């Protein structure tokens, strides 16, 4: 498990360096390096349970976003993207970095064990549930979520939807306009990480 963790660290660091080197090369030549689109998105429900129309209410149920300030990891594809478009006023989402993923799992990570919410306080709980997918530890689980590994569906579903607090420091003045309009709803790109720091 330690050896797997070390190789994951080297993998994250290697991918990050290559992104910097490719950007530097493009700037030098005067061309443009278009980075890879995100495969992972973190979604936080910002609206309570009142006054929700039927389609959005169903979509948030399918997203396991049943309570305000709940959070989930979602694999980003065309099917997921169109679902998030319908619930843009009711959620906010963006690209989480490595610190967000590992801290969500270390501090607020709970596993669905026999349909019960169990704290991830020992690597045995992870191995019992996801050992068939070669996931033996919390770092194995973090790596699977962050890199969207081939067993992302089983790993992400095993994680209970995160029960975040209200953000320390509050929200923006008006929560329920789009992030582009200076509100809090909808896609906010890497700013999802600053929001999670206040909520985790």
């Amino acid at each position: 498990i330690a050896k797997r963790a070390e190789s994951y660290d080297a993998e994250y660091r290697k991918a990050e360096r290559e992104q910097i080197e490719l950007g530097r090369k493009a700037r030098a030549e005067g061309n443009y390096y278009v980075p890879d689109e995100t495969k992972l998105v973190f979604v936080i429900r910002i609206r309570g349970i009142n006054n929700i129309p039927p389609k959005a209410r169903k979509i948030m149920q399918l997203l396991r976003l049943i309570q305000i300030n709940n959070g989930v990891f979602v694999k980003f594809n065309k099917a997921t993207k169109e679902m998030l478009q319908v619930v843009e006023p009711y959620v906010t989402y963006g690209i989480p970095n490595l610190k967000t993923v590992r801290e969500l799992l270390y501090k607020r990570g709970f596993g669905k064990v026999n349909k019960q919410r169990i704290a991830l306080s020992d690597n045995a709980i992870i191995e019992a549930a996801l050992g068939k997918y070669s996931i033996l530890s919390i770092e194995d689980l973090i790596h699977e979520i962050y890199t969207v590994g081939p067993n992302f569906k089983q790993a992400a579903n095993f994680i209970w939807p995160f029960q975040l607090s209200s953000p320390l420091g509050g929200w923006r003045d008006r929560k329920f306009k789009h992030f582009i309009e200076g509100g809090d709803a909808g896609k906010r790109d890497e700013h999802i990480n600053s929001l999670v720091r206040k909520m985790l």
Binding site: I1, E6, D9, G30, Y106, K107, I138
Partner: protein, 51 residues
């Protein structure tokens, strides 16, 4: 078993129970030990300052 959740980010002993790699984890590696070239380019800077 498990009467009280302990945050591994605060309780170092719990962080050792999970993640055996934490002991050997080396943060803050220096990679700028070389001459540190500049990568801006002539075309990039003339595009940057237009208008």
């Amino acid at each position: 078993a498990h009467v009280q959740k302990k945050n591994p980010l605060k309780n170092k002993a719990v962080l050792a129970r999970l993640n055996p790699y934490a002991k050997a984890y080396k943060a803050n590696v220096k990679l700028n030990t070389g001459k540190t070239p500049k990568a801006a380019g002539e075309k990039f800077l003339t595009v940057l300052h237009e208008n």
